[PDB]
Design a protein around this ligand. Structure first.
Ligand SMILES: Nc1nc2c(ncn2[C@@H]2O[C@H](COP(=O)(O)OP(=O)(O)OP(=O)(O)O)[C@@H](O)[C@H]2O)c(=O)[nH]1
Ligand SMILES: [Mg+2]
Lengths: 86, 87, 81, 48, 90, 481, 88, 73, 83, 97
């Protein structure tokens, strides 16, 4: 309501896209469907991208950004580095 | 509102579990604890790059999970009703 | 100065968020704070390794991923020699 | 077939029974005046 | 709702005075006589022969180890037959 | 049926760190057999068959270790009575207690003396009403002169509430009078050395018990239950501030020597005796609804059919809900009475006739399980048909095993005179519980043993050693009683 | 013998205005030097005149100085607090 | 239930060895503790893997940084 | 599910199998007759083949009665019914 | 040689030393502090505690009317002093029965 989590409520009240950086080094782009005080959120229309360096024949290749589309998302709170309300 | 009750309401669903260390679990949910640990059946487990193995049941303890992928046919809006009593 | 009044005195003013990994800092205006002192902060712009990485906007920062937060009243964040 | 009574009821019944209730509290009152000693004296053909 | 001490912590309280072997998450292994134990798994030991994965064999006396930094104890077999493992019929 | 595992108890004998060998001694009818009854009813599932009992027989004391027909008919103990029980401490660690219940009549004090040879410590049971009596003085004097560690059990506390009907301050003065009487006799036995062997509740070697209602506590356990009920309380400091001329000031919350606050009570009266007095008064004085609410205010909950029980049965249920098990007695014996190692060193110093620098004396000093067998037999118990005797003694070295070739050595055995010696054969090992015998294939060092087939050469006491010591060594006898 | 609570030590540092040295939580080369301004029951440290010290990875000498000023440091990152006894 | 005080009563006025995460060592006489075992010491000396001594004075150590205690005597 | 014979995955990838006896609210397991199972990815290079064989070799250890903390548990798996 | 009171305070202090100054937590109260030591039914409760059977009970089974001997304890107890010979002989014959 009046705390920081209200922006997630503002994410609920507007259904806007949100960019989430996670402690695994990956990034999420999703619309916030539900949240709580414990920052456990449920998301819809989810597109998750990350960066990996493929090692081909023992040589470290260039970093490639790839992605995956997930319809329904249950992201757990403590792994989130940071949340950006776009 | 606590999301553990929403974990209670989404039982008997074939989900995919991504853990805090990196292993992947998949299968249909048997039950979930009020401390958000969950026991699951018809389990396939993939570790970091070695061969996956399938077991009939697996009780994964929830402080080491990263996230879930639920079935896309799950009616989230029907589960969003608050059945807990008002204090 | 007690910590909760200290961060209550830094509401809606120029603040630096020194995060906990990756050598990341944020510059902006501390909008709101709870009893767990999570951060809702607006007009965020982000530096990594003391070089600019860019503006983001309205940002929720969880306090467990943060080294510390300070006031930015006339403070330069270039690496001093 | 079964009874249970409260403290005021048992107190009242005990107070009403004082013509016909024993006032002996110590079992040591019955030293050598009990069934075992009577049977022992019967065995020895003596009388307490 | 009084905080009932768990059966594992009860078994750890049974294990004091015996010889236990502790494996920590910080890499150390101790074999020693468990002198003192707490409800939050802080343990004071005596004999403590030391064994790590890098081969740190050493011997010394008296140690305090906190319960957050440990992985698991190994306790004698006879403690399996403790009275806590028999179901009290209620 | 018992509430522990007998295999677990046999595992517990292979550990002479946590074993305690104690004798319960005191004046006639002061409550030693009732203390044993409390421990038995804690450890044995026999309350079910005691509740199937009607008439005057259901009002009888259990008296588990009184098994002689003389003991049953006379209503007093005439023989020593051993048991081995698994008892839990406050922290939850189970220990093996080997406890001998001695008689309290003066004529049978020799049995006490036999028990005093085999035990590491003596729990002296003193009735709070009669206080120290002539047999209490005799037992105190003998246990002090033989340098046996001593603890105090003040029994029959309910009398102070139910028989004397004195206020709790005067109950404190009666308790302090009995404690100082015990300490006076201890000091009169050894003049000048009574400070080292002093019994006082703040030292933790004094236990307050009511054995008819089956409860006991120390000041440490009562401060412990205060800490359990509230939290943040330091048990040892609160316990040592619960005795003496120490008064609690409730607005200042401070313990002083004089009542600097108006209406301040003594700390032992304020925190201990008045809760017990109020517990007794409200249990026996209130109806089922008032008692149910009163006990619910302290978290004490009985079964709904038990609130209309008879006042003695109801009082026993309320007491076992309030005080709990006998963990305070276990704590007192663990803290103030030595293991068989220390008491074995003292025993070999005091009652052994051979040299102490030899290998068998080192096996007896260290309570070595793998050494050669040495047992000091001081008691003989007749069988059910009374044709033969079992030899009751203490395995001090080796393991007593069935079918073992042994030499029984009489009191007159020496090196130059091997006349008083008989080669005999151990047939079956027993753990004695004084109403049943647990058949065992082994009892290690520092424990109590009941052997069969080695009784014939024993007159009063004996020393049972192996047929041959593997180091080629001569054997000696223990001193007579 | 009298016990010293750590919160009593922090209060003594606050009333004495003694500068302190704070190690970061398994950042072995990174410390904070500053005079204490405030603390709470979670020992979150409001610090004044604080400078960040980065130690050398080879011999652990101070390499860089980063003056930062007044900082509320989170309580979960303190490893050790050294009372810097000034030469008076 | 609130956490009880840890059993550090034997270690009062004793020179102790403290092994901390990051393999740090702190050698110093004990001064006091709390119900969480944040530990305050006097005459503190820091020890690194190279084997040198650092003087600290009297210090405090966070409980979660505390891994191992060890009595020298 | 008390006394059911179970296998436990440890934080460092190790396995802890055997007869479980107890558990509490913190998911700490009392586990009897325990066998610790360790996996190491060895590069077994044969003298005749240039390709180093990648094999996850298995090594055993016995412990007996064990007590594992819930802060280092990952997952709980069924091994076998009690014998 | 040293007292328990002259170990807690110190000789004639009549106070805990303020450097140690042990204080209980404010929540700590005696177990039945609000409740009274007695009740108006407590004298009767203790009096009934020592009453002969069945008056020391509060529950039981009902017996036949002819199974209640009202005056049996008269001749199970010692006879009163200064009886006639006939009364004493009757007491002894009821004892014999
Ligand atoms: N009021 C009261 N009476 C008790 C208590 N404990 C035991 N008694 C009574 O005191 C008598 C003691 O008998 P025992 O149990 O044989 O006492 P003892 O200590 O073994 O004495 P000995 O027979 O000489 O061995 C019994 O008749 C009990 O009814 C008690 O806690 N309170
Ligand atoms: Mg007896």
């Amino acid at each position: 309501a009046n705390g920081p989590l209200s922006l997630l409520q503002t994410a609920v009240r507007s259904h806007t896209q949100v960019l989430i950086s996670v402690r695994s080094g990956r990034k999420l782009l999703a619309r916030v469907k539900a949240f709580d005080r414990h920052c456990n959120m449920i998301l819809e229309n989810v597109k998750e991208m990350w960066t990996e360096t493929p090692v081909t024949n023992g040589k470290k290749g260039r970093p490639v950004n790839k992605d995956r589309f997930i319809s329904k998302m249950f992201l757990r709170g403590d792994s989130v580095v940071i949340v950006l309300l776009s | 509102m606590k999301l553990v009750r929403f974990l209670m309401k989404c039982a008997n669903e074939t989900v995919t579990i991504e853990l805090k260390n990196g292993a992947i679990v998949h299968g249909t949910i048997a039950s979930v604890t009020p401390k958000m640990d969950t026991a699951l059946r018809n389990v396939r487990y993939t570790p970091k790059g070695e061969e996956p193995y399938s077991v009939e049941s697996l009780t994964v303890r929830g402080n080491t999970i990263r996230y879930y992928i639920l079935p896309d046919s799950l009616p989230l809006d029907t589960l969003l009703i608050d059945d807990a009593p008002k204090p | 100065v007690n910590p909760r009044p200290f961060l209550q005195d830094l509401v809606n003013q120029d603040v630096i968020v020194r995060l906990k990994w990756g050598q990341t800092e944020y510059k902006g205006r501390l909008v709101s704070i709870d009893s767990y002192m999570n951060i809702q902060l607006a007009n965020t712009e982000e530096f990594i390794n003391y070089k600019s990485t860019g503006h983001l906007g309205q940002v929720l920062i969880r306090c467990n991923n943060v080294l510390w937060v300070t006031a930015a009243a006339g403070k330069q964040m270039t690496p001093t020699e | 077939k079964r009874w249970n009574l409260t403290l005021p009821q048992m107190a009242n019944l005990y107070r009403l029974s004082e013509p016909l209730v024993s006032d002996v509290v110590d079992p040591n009152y019955f030293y050598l005046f009990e069934l075992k000693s009577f049977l022992t004296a019967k065995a020895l053909n003596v009388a307490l | 709702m009084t905080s009932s001490i768990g059966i594992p912590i009860k078994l750890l309280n049974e294990a004091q005075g015996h010889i236990v072997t502790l494996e920590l998450t910080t890499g150390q292994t101790y074999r020693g006589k468990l002198i003192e134990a707490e409800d939050n798994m802080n343990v004071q030991l005596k004999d403590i022969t030391v064994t790590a994965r890098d081969g740190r064999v050493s011997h010394l006396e008296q140690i305090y180890i906190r319960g957050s930094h440990v992985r698991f104890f190994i306790v004698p077999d006879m403690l399996r037959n403790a009275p806590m493992f028999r179901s009290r019929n209620v | 049926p018992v509430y522990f595992d007998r295999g677990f108890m046999t595992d517990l004998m292979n550990f002479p760190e946590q074993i305690r060998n104690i004798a319960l001694a005191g004046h006639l009818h002061h409550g030693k057999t009732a203390f044993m009854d409390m421990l038995v009813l804690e450890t044995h599932a026999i309350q079910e068959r005691l509740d199937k009992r009607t008439g005057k027989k259901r009002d009888e004391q259990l008296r588990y270790t009184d098994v002689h027909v003389i003991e049953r008919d006379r209503g007093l103990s005439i023989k020593a009575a051993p048991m081995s029980l698994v008892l839990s401490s406050t922290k939850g660690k189970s220990h093996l207690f080997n406890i001998i219940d001695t008689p309290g009549h003066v004529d049978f004090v020799d049995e006490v003396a036999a028990a005093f040879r085999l035990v590491d410590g003596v729990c002296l049971v003193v009735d709070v009403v009669e206080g120290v009596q002539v047999n209490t003085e005799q037992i105190i004097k003998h246990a002090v002169l033989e340098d046996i560690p001593l603890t105090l059990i003040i029994n029959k506390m309910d009398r102070l509430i139910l028989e004397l009907k004195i206020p709790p301050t005067d109950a404190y003065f009666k308790l302090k009078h009995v404690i100082e009487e015990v300490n006076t006799v201890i000091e009169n036995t050894i003049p000048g050395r009574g400070e080292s062997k002093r019994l006082s509740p703040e030292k933790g070697n004094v236990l307050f018990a009511c054995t008819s209602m089956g409860w006991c506590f120390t000041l440490q356990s009562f401060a412990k239950m205060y800490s359990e009920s509230y939290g943040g309380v330091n048990v040892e400091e609160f316990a040592r501030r619960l005795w003496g001329d120490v008064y609690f000031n409730p607005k200042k919350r401070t313990f002083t020597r004089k009542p600097i606050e108006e209406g301040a009570k003594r700390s032992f009266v304020n925190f201990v005796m008045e809760p017990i007095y109020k517990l007794y008064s409200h249990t026996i004085s209130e109806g089922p609804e008032d008692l149910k609410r009163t006990l619910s205010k302290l978290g004490i909950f009985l079964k709904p059919s038990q609130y209309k029980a008879d006042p003695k049965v109801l009082m026993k249920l309320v007491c076992e809900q309030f005080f709990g098990p006998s963990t305070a007695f276990v704590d007192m014996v663990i803290k103030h009475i030595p293991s068989p190692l220390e008491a074995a060193e003292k025993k070999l110093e005091r009652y052994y006739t051979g040299p102490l620098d030899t290998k068998i004396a080192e096996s007896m000093k260290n309570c070595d399980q793998n050494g050669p067998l040495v047992v000091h037999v001081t008691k003989l118990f007749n069988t059910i048909d009374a044709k033969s005797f079992y030899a009751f003694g203490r395995v001090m070295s080796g393991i007593a095993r069935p079918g073992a070739d042994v030499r029984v050595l009489g009191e007159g055995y020496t090196l130059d005179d091997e006349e008083d010696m008989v080669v005999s054969r151990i047939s079956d090992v027993f753990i004695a519980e004084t109403r049943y015998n647990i058949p065992t294939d082994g009892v290690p060092a520092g424990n109590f043993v009941l052997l069969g087939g080695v009784d014939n050469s024993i007159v009063k006491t004996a020393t049972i050693v192996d047929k041959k010591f593997d180091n080629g060594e001569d054997a000696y006898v223990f001193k007579p009683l | 013998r009298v016990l010293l609570p750590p919160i009593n030590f922090l209060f003594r540092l606050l009333q004495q205005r003694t500068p302190v040295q704070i190690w970061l939580y398994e950042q072995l080369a990174i410390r904070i030097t500053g005079v204490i301004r405030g603390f709470d029951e979670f020992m979150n440290l409001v610090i004044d005149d604080a400078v960040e010290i980065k130690l050398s990875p080879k011999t652990n000498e101070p390499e860089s100085k980063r003056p930062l000023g007044q900082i509320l440091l989170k309580g979960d990152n303190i490893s050790l607090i050294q009372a810097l006894s000034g030469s008076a | 239930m609130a956490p009880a005080q840890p059993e550090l009563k034997k270690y009062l006025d004793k020179r102790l060895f403290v092994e901390l995460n990051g393999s740090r060592r702190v050698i110093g006489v004990l001064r006091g503790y709390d119900v969480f075992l944040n530990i305050v010491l006097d005459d503190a000396v820091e020890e690194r893997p190279n084997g040198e001594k650092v003087k600290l004075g009297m210090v405090t150590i966070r409980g979660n940084s505390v891994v191992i205690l060890e009595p020298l005597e | 599910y008390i006394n059911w014979r179970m296998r436990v995955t440890l934080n460092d990838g190790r396995q802890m199998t055997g007869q479980m006896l107890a558990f509490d609210k913190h998911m700490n397991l009392v586990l009897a007759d325990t066998e610790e199972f360790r996996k190491t990815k060895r590069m077994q290079a044969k003298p005749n083949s240039s390709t180093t064989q990648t094999l996850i070799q298995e090594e055993k250890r016995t412990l007996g009665l064990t007590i594992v903390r819930g802060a280092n548990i990952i997952a709980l798996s069924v091994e076998s019914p009690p014998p | 040689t040293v007292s328990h009171e002259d170990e807690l305070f110190g000789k004639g202090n009549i106070e805990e030393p303020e450097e140690e100054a042990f204080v209980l937590p404010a929540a700590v109260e005696p177990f039945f502090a609000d409740e009274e030591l007695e009740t108006e039914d407590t004298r009767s409760a203790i009096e009934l505690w020592w009453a002969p059977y069945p008056f020391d009970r509060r529950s039981g089974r009902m017996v036949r009317a002819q199974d209640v001997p009202l005056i049996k304890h008269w001749y199970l107890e010692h006879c009163p002093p200064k009886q006639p010979v006939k009364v004493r002989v009757s007491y002894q014959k009821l004892l014999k029965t």
